[PDB]
Ligand binder design. Structure first.
Ligand code: C2E
Ligand code: C2E
Ligand code: C2E
Ligand code: C2E
Ligand code: ATP
Ligand code: ATP
Ligand code: MG
Ligand code: MG
Lengths: 51, 243, 280, 243, 279, 22
């Protein structure tokens, strides 16, 4: 079950299907500190493993 | 308050920082006691304690002696309590003495309630022993010392940190791609990070050889001023006694 | 004796790699060789290049010599090729005899127009014979760090009343009230000033400091250079004084504090530990 | 030939050195097996093992499963045996599981007699736990990893290490005056010192981030060549068994 | 004796701070200005100063053109003011027309004694007109590192049959038998030469090195710079040939080695660990 | 001069002298 302040999971019951909702993915990192973090994740497999 | 310092792994620099933060608090005019909870008994050596001096609080309890008589006064406002020199048999057999040191908890909370010391610093080791878990529970706040490397990055995910702790960075080299990448990942993933860090400084490596805290060894050293900034941050954020 | 009014003795850096623009242009590798050639000139245009802060004092000496020894017919310019320069340095070079300082953000086009603009211009301002008068006004205070309450007020008031400096932009006076969690002498250890013009003192449970030649719109950025932690976290209240009338009036009020209310730093700005019994 | 590598102090570089020594020994054409005796379980990460992969020899035993089924092959000549990811309860309560795992010491006696591997390296943690002493008694030879600092200098004068064990310097820096004084003193005082050391190399900091041994990540790196020299020294001096 | 037989044209560094020793001494700031003055002398003494190994080639030019043009009465010395200098560079300078090379470890007193000893000498040795001949005299074989057995033999043979190299001291040939504990391919990984001209090969359970222009005395010093460990711990037996006939004789024996007994070094997106079961 | 350098290193660092003068 997810964070109630971020998401919510619905149950159909009629058909055995679950639809999960979440807040839109929004990132407010600077135009450089986000660019270099992506390059750092591409560079080291150990960093990308915890992403 | 009672402030514990614990490294996320060994060698990270917990002892040297604990001594330096204690000296910085006594320079700010605060009555501080610093106790060594590591069986290595290395904190005493940053205060010109002769290496042959075996006396310490754990050494007293195992010998059936008063641990209060194991104290040492460095300055008017800085007192220290070493762990004590264990024999080779004792250190290679930790099972023999671990469960026989719980008396320090009652004595610590009495010292706490006394009011003589405005800060009590505890140098905690990396083991998960019963005594270190007990001393960590008696602390008001804690600092988790890390170094910016792949080792600590792994541990920070697979190792549970104490609640409300704050992470302190030591041995900060400038000019390393992997370190800067791990750092920039920590800046946006670690909410428990401090607003300061301690650069790698030759003074931090020389002071232990000189058997002094780094603040007394070179007050002009960058690491010394960075730890002095840590003391002022402690006064502003860690002075409360959370019960 | 044909006049050298059309002659242009310039540092090569001024042209930004462009070729000599006319038969009157003479380019030189550095300001020293440029100075040595300009000593025999009369009405020529001399254009120095200011690229690093280390050149400021040598450049002032060269301009001063040329202005004193060669008269007011010569036109002396300083072309900035850098942005990391204090605004008081432009006033120093203009006081030593330079007609005009060309800012770094002016392109070559604007630079050349300004070189043409000073043609026919006769120097009218006064320049002293001894440069030490002008050089000592780059550092008026000659003090840094903590000063006693009486020494702080005396030193800042003497620079404040010093006639050679003009009004407006004279400095900033900040009075900071510490958060109750920290004491004044403790927060004094956090205030670490770098520039040899900035002094601090403590008294009346207030940390006051003076910043020489600080625009009020650059005060907060100057505090980030002096405090490791944010000033809002260390101090609860801030009172600022930037204009001369308010600063001198605040200094008169600061004089009305008894010496018993003044402050001093902590007594720590081989040992041997001794045994003791704890908790007795 | 079972070789035990252990740190004089935590964080000196034992895990990265054993992984590199394993790669260097299999590169020389020897059949090697590497076991991870540290609860941190960090050795597996130098061989591109997924962090979510919790299998290991210690985890298999404590779960009732077979320890032989937890092996992983890296090359035709390098076999890897991870420790296993512990639970949060097991990290905080090391005493409950500390002595349930003496079967691996009997199981290593089988492998030592199996002849399948010419070298079995053991990544030993810096503690006095029972399993660590049991595993250390199986090793025919032992290496002690240090850094040239005051912490290790003190530990070398107060902490006992296995008989016949040699000292391997790691993270040797350049320019440090206090290191020059300790090292120059060691060269004339330390008799158990090895004839080669391992400099500080950015490759050693990057290889763990790249999940590769340093000999594979950057074979021409200075540390890779120094560890390769160590591998040959092991072939020359650490080939004979202990009775 | 001639007019300027008593003149001493010397670099200022030669005197090591002392004042000019006599009215005959005339000092100069560098070797080029000194060489310019020395083009007019007839029997003067010329003392260059050698401070960097980069100066070896241009210095050999100045000495060569001086000796050819100015004759046999002139005395030309080279004073080493730097220990950073190979022994073959002294051979080159003497071959270009220098009477004597003053070694760096000789004190000022010894240096002055050697400058005076050259007085009265007439240069007899033959110096070629082309300097390319002399510069090629100090060129080792342009190979480094491991070579295949036949490639190793061809390189050393072609160097022994190089007419431009001098008679003796062409290098040392070493054959090393490894300790039973370590194999030849493994012992090869320890062999790490820095100099161009130092080659190695493996074949018939022997590591064979050739060290260009190495003297038999410097053999142990050079070996210590090739191997990180002492060669006594790596190799039980050692065979050495340092004279031309010996090396060329050992090479005709090496050529007899069958190709099946020739060795080669050990062989050694990311690797993935595969699950397995022990025993 | 190697005997000299060690003597100065002991004088510089009390921790080194403490273990060498026992
Ligand atoms: N970002 C920033 N940092 C500042 C400022 N003022 C001082 N600092 C810092 O404080 C250091 C010492 O300043 P100082 O006593 O004025 O001492 C200075 C000053 O005497 C002189 N200097 C440097 N730059 C200039 C400049 O642009 N103009 C003038 N007139 N002097 C300069 O050289 C000395 C050494 O300078 P540094 O090594 O750069 O080191 C400077 C710099 O790290 C400022 O406005 N902004
Ligand atoms: N009294 C005092 N005032 C301070 C201090 N730090 C900043 N200020 C004030 O803030 C202005 C802008 O600072 P900035 O962004 O660092 O911008 C500076 C900086 O980038 C550079 N700069 C000036 N002096 C120095 C210096 O000594 N060292 C270095 N490294 N840079 C300098 O030139 C720019 C313009 O300098 P200014 O015109 O002097 O203008 C400075 C000055 O009026 C300080 O520590 N003390
Ligand atoms: N085969 C071999 N032998 C080696 C090597 N390195 C050192 N040796 C031997 O060891 C002697 C002393 O070495 P050094 O102190 O490095 O002494 C050297 C070194 O300080 C410097 N030098 C000479 N050649 C070079 C070069 O190619 N590069 C650099 N960086 N220095 C050089 O000048 C000194 C003169 O050397 P020598 O008179 O020949 O004397 C050398 C040489 O006989 C090597 O890589 N291979
Ligand atoms: N300390 C020391 N290091 C050594 C020695 N021999 C080799 N090395 C190291 O190995 C590098 C390659 O040497 P090389 O192939 O002989 O290549 C050398 C050689 O061909 C020539 N050279 C340099 N120094 C000398 C010298 O003293 N005498 C002569 N005759 N040639 C030199 O220039 C090339 C580039 O030299 P480096 O940049 O110095 O680079 C040298 C140096 O870093 C030695 O005797 N002492
Ligand atoms: N910022 C630093 N710059 C340079 N050297 C440092 C720095 N921090 C620590 N050191 C050095 O690192 C070594 C280890 O430090 P320290 O003893 O404080 O670590 P630790 O975490 O207590 O280690 P352990 O508890 O495992 O013994 C010492 O020699 C110390 O001088
Ligand atoms: N010579 C070296 N140069 C640079 N970085 C090094 C060097 N040796 C080790 N490191 C790095 O320092 C850290 C040492 O961690 P490692 O796990 O190898 O040591 P350890 O002694 O086994 O520590 P622990 O067992 O306490 O976790 C790693 O990030 C490693 O990459
Ligand atoms: Mg410690
Ligand atoms: Mg490890």
């Amino acid at each position: 079950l997810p964070d109630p302040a971020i998401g919510y999971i619905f149950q159909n019951d009629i058909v055995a299907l679950k639809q999960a909702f979440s807040l839109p993915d929004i990132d407010y990192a600077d135009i450089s500190q986000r660019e270099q973090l992506a390059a750092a994740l591409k560079r080291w497999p150990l960093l990308a493993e915890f992403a | 308050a009672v402030l514990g310092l614990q490294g996320v792994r060994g060698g990270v620099g917990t002892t040297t920082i604990t001594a330096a933060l204690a000296w910085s608090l006594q320079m700010l005019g605060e009555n501080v006691l610093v106790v060594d909870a590591c069986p290595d008994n290395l904190l005493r050596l940053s205060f010109n304690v002769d290496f042959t001096h075996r006396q310490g609080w754990a050494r007293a309890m195992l010998d059936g002696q008063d641990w209060r008589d194991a104290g040492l006064r460095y300055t008017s406002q800085l007192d220290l309590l070493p762990f004590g020199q264990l024999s080779i048999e004792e250190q290679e057999n930790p099972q023999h003495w671990q469960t026989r040191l719980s008396d320090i908890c009652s004595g610590l909370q009495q010292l706490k309630a006394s009011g003589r010391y405005q800060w009590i610093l505890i140098d905690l080791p990396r083991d998960a022993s019963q005594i270190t878990h007990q001393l960590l529970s008696l602390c008001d706040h804690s600092l988790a010392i890390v170094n910016v490397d792949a080792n600590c990055h792994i541990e920070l995910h697979q190792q549970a940190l104490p609640d409300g702790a704050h992470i302190l960075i030591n041995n900060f080299r400038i000019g390393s791609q992997v370190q800067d990448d791990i750092y920039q990942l920590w800046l946006q993933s670690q909410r428990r990070l401090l607003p300061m860090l301690i650069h790698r400084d030759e003074a931090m490596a020389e002071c232990l050889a000189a058997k002094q805290p780094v603040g007394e060894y070179r007050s002009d050293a960058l690491a010394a001023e960075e730890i002095l900034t840590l003391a002022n941050w402690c006064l502003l954020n860690y002075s409360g006694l959370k019960t | 004796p044909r006049s050298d009014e059309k002659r242009i003795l310039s540092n090569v850096a001024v042209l930004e790699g462009a070729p000599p623009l006319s038969e009157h242009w003479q380019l030189f590798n550095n300001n020293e060789v440029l100075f040595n050639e300009a000593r025999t000139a009369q009405a020529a245009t001399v254009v120095f290049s200011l690229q690093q802060n280390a050149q400021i004092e040598p450049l002032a000496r060269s301009i001063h010599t040329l202005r004193r020894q060669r008269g007011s017919a010569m036109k002396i310019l300083v072309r900035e090729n850098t942005a990391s320069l204090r605004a008081t340095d432009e006033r120093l070079l203009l006081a030593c005899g330079a007609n005009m300082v060309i800012p770094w953000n002016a392109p070559l086009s604007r630079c050349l127009t300004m070189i043409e603009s000073v043609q026919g211009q006769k120097f009218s301002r006064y320049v002293p014979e001894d440069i030490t008068t002008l050089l000592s006004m780059t550092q008026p205070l000659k003090l840094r760090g903590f000063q006693k309450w009486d020494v702080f007020c005396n030193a800042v008031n003497n620079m404040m009343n010093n006639p050679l400096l003009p009004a407006h932009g004279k400095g900033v006076l900040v009075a900071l009230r510490p958060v109750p969690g920290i004491r004044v002498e403790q927060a004094l250890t956090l205030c670490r000033p770098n520039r040899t013009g900035d002094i601090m003192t403590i008294g009346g449970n207030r940390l006051v400091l003076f910043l020489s030649f600080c625009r009020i719109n650059d005060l907060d950025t100057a505090l980030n250079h002096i405090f490791p932690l944010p000033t809002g976290d260390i101090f609860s209240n801030r009172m600022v004084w930037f204009e001369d009338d308010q600063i001198s009036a605040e200094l008169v009020q600061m004089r009305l504090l008894a010496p018993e209310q003044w402050g001093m730093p902590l007594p720590l700005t081989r040992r041997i530990p001794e045994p003791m019994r704890l908790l007795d």
